[PDB]
Design a protein around this ligand. Sequence first.
Ligand SMILES: OCc1cc(-c2ccccc2)on1
Ligand SMILES: OCc1cc(-c2ccccc2)on1
Lengths: 268, 269
Amino acid sequence: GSLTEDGLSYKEKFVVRSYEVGSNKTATVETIANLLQEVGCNHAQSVGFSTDGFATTTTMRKLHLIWVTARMHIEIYKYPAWGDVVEIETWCQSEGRIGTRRDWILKDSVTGEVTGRATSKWVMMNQDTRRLQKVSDDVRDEYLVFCPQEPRLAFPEENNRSLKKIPKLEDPAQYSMIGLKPRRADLDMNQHVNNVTYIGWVLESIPQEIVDTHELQVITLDYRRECQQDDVVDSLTTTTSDSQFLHLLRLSGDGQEINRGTTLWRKK
Amino acid sequence: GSLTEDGLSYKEKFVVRSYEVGSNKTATVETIANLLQEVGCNHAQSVGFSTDGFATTTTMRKLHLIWVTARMHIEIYKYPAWGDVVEIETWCQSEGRIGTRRDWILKDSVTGEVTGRATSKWVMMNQDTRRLQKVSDDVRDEYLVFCPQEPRLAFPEENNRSLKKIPKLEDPAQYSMIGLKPRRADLDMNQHVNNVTYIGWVLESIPQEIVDTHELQVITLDYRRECQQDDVVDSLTTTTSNDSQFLHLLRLSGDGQEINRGTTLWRKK
Ligand SMILES: OCc1cc(-c2ccccc2)on1
Ligand SMILES: OCc1cc(-c2ccccc2)on1
């Protein structure tokens, strides 16, 4: 991979692996999300930021501050097949003291056709207290020189799917998968549950008949609280409709919300 | 990747990814096992066999026959760090009507030093009845031209660890992790649990204090029965031992049916 000519974005190509595909012999949405995280990490490394998923500066590390994902939104038009080469371009853009956006565009390397796009909202938090704090005009200045200054959006329209408010699923759920728990492979280098694991947990409560007859076109997922390595999660889903679903992940015992989301599926 | 000059082995290089590493910022043993499966699949593709993990011929597919892993044995000297390039060479060799072996050598791409090695034993089975059968001359003949004919072993040593018999862990286990179940990411393209998932389940019952102060040097794992996508598994471990050694058993949560047994050897950091 490499920074582009203007140095304000990063591109990398990936060959889809045998263990990365689902029953259609094409990449799963979790494989796509792992590749989005990989190119985001390589972009941080290319310019000197931390490579632990938090993309921090030396000053943020002295203050115990990190960037954390509040929302992930992914839209896929065509999943790449096993052995196909997919090229992913990514960039960041500040959205004021509230937070920052990282966007991605996925392309078929042979045709140059756009096969998917994604956007994510990040907030700054103290890693120990978990309290959010607005971005200072000294931390912000460190990042501005690596971002485009004119708006560059993977989802340009005023109020498109990526910005829609997500309601809270009400009991009883139509479908559920309970007692889900992370194993060591689900953790990152810091022993935290990887953001992609929550996507897998959301999808566990979609009926197998939908997965067999449909393809996932859009997934929007809010992150409210972490699942600790010793927590247990319940995944709940209700049809709201193409087929559309509302999703909720909550801790198995007291029912504390950890994530909410929606998915849209197209018939094959 | 590519077949080598003599066409009897296959080589491929991989750059270690950010999500592929553990707490030491080096590749996990599950990442290594996934790369061993990837290069095995690319080797099958390169010569025309199936690319579904079973490496079958047209004749085997007509007979509903597949190759299945009976044992996996991995020894790692140095785990590659994030961003490092590891080169893996793999080849197969028949061991008579009983089955076949696939071996692998892992090297540091910059230095050329051997950083790990692995071997696996495969048997032929009917995919529907699950009955094993001795390899026929007509099936074996299809494979012989892609394998070295003189012995080529990743583990040549006299009574090496890769061939040792594994005993059955007796209750009570010293440690356990109960109620493990696969999710869709644990399945392959044919909706079967990926062989690497069982390695992860075996390691779930190793105490975190061992993982934090030791590195996994050797893992030997026998595969006796599949965990179905709707089954639940219990992972049991007992210390058998500076080095620490463990005996492992995976069994179905309800009736206690064995699915895997294994051993691990760990060296203090
Ligand atoms: O303010 C957060 C942020 C992070 C980045 C970034 C830019 C380039 C590479 C990696 C991270 O830009 N803004
Ligand atoms: O007898 C089983 C077997 C499988 C293979 C093989 C050789 C080359 C590539 C893929 C598979 O060789 N022997």
